[PDB]
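hey
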C-alpha cells in the first residue's frame, strides 16, 4: 500500500533491495532505481513515493527531488561528527573501529539533515565486508523501523566535523606508514568499484588487495601493472 523508492548502487545493496521488495510485496510497492538517469523529478513524481531510501548513492540528489519527497540517506558517521565524503576511509584513517549509521533527511547541505535515528557499526575487515555489514543493518533493521514507526527526524546538535571526498591518487601508500597503517590502507580500499591501495615502482603500479596480518608481515594479493 505504501509507495517507496530504493535508490542504490553496489551489487550487495541491489541484491538486498530485490530481496526486500520480494519479501514485502504485501506492505510496500517498491521501485528499485540503480542509475543516475532513472532518478529524475519527472520520473519520480509518477511513482509518488512516501520515502526515497538511499542505502548507497553516488551522485548529487537533485533539489527538485529532495524538496518534494522525503529522501533518506544512510551516512556511516555519528553525525554531526564526520559530515561529508568517503566516510569509511576517513574513519579508518582516523583509527576508528566503531561508528554509527545515521538515517537522515536530505536537505541540500552536506549531511546537515535532521536525523531519524542511528545504529552501531563495527569497522573491522575490508571495505566490501564493512559495506555489506552496514547494508544488512540498513535493510534488516533500519528500513523496517523507519517505514513502520515513521519517526519525526530531529535537528543535529553539537559541533560538526567535515570529511572530504578522497581522490584516487590518495590510494598511494607511503613508505613512512607503519605496518598496521599499510594494512588499514589495503583493506579500506578493497571493495567493489574502489581504487586499490598502491605503490609506484618506476613506471609500474603495484595494487594490493586481500591483506592478512601475520607476525611481522602482511600477506596480500598484488597486481603489478605496466604503465
Amino acid at each position: 500500500l505504501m509507495n517507496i523508492i530504493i535508490a542504490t548502487t553496489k551489487s550487495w545493496n541491489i541484491k538486498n533491495a530485490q530481496k526486500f521488495k520480494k519479501e514485502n510485496e504485501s506492505k510496500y510497492n517498491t521501485t528499485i532505481i540503480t542509475n543516475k538517469d532513472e532518478l529524475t523529478f519527472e520520473k519520480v513524481k509518477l511513482i509518488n513515493p512516501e520515502y526515497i531510501l538511499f542505502p548507497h548513492w553516488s551522485w548529487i540528489i537533485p533539489k527538485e527531488i529532495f524538496e518534494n519527497f522525503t529522501c533518506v540517506v544512510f551516512h556511516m558517521t555519528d553525525l554531526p561528527f564526520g559530515r561529508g565524503g568517503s566516510p569509511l576511509q576517513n574513519l579508518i584513517e582516523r583509527g576508528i573501529k566503531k561508528t554509527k549509521i545515521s538515517a537522515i533527511k536530505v536537505d541540500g547541505g552536506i549531511d546537515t539533515g535532521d536525523i531519524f535515528f542511528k545504529r552501531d557499526l563495527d569497522l573491522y575487515g575490508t571495505a566490501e565486508e564493512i559495506f555489506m555489514r552496514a547494508s544488512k543493518i540498513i535493510f534488516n533493521d533500519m528500513i523496517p523501523e523507519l517505514l513502520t514507526k515513521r519517526p519525526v527526524p530531529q535537528k543535529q546538535e553539537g559541533e560538526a566535523t567535515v570529511f572530504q571526498r578522497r581522490k584516487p591518487e590518495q590510494s598511494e601508500i607511503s613508505p613512512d606508514f607503519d605496518l598496521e597503517k599499510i594494512y588499514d590502507y589495503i583493506r579500506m580500499l578493497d571493495g567493489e568499484g574502489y581504487p586499490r591501495a598502491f605503490i609506484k615502482y618506476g613506471k609500474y603500479r603495484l595494487e594490493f588487495s586481500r591483506a592478512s596480518m601475520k607476525n611481522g608481515k602482511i600477506i596480500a594479493d598484488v597486481e603489478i601493472i605496466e604503465g
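The chain has two domains: 1-165, 166-227. The radius of gyration is 19 Å.
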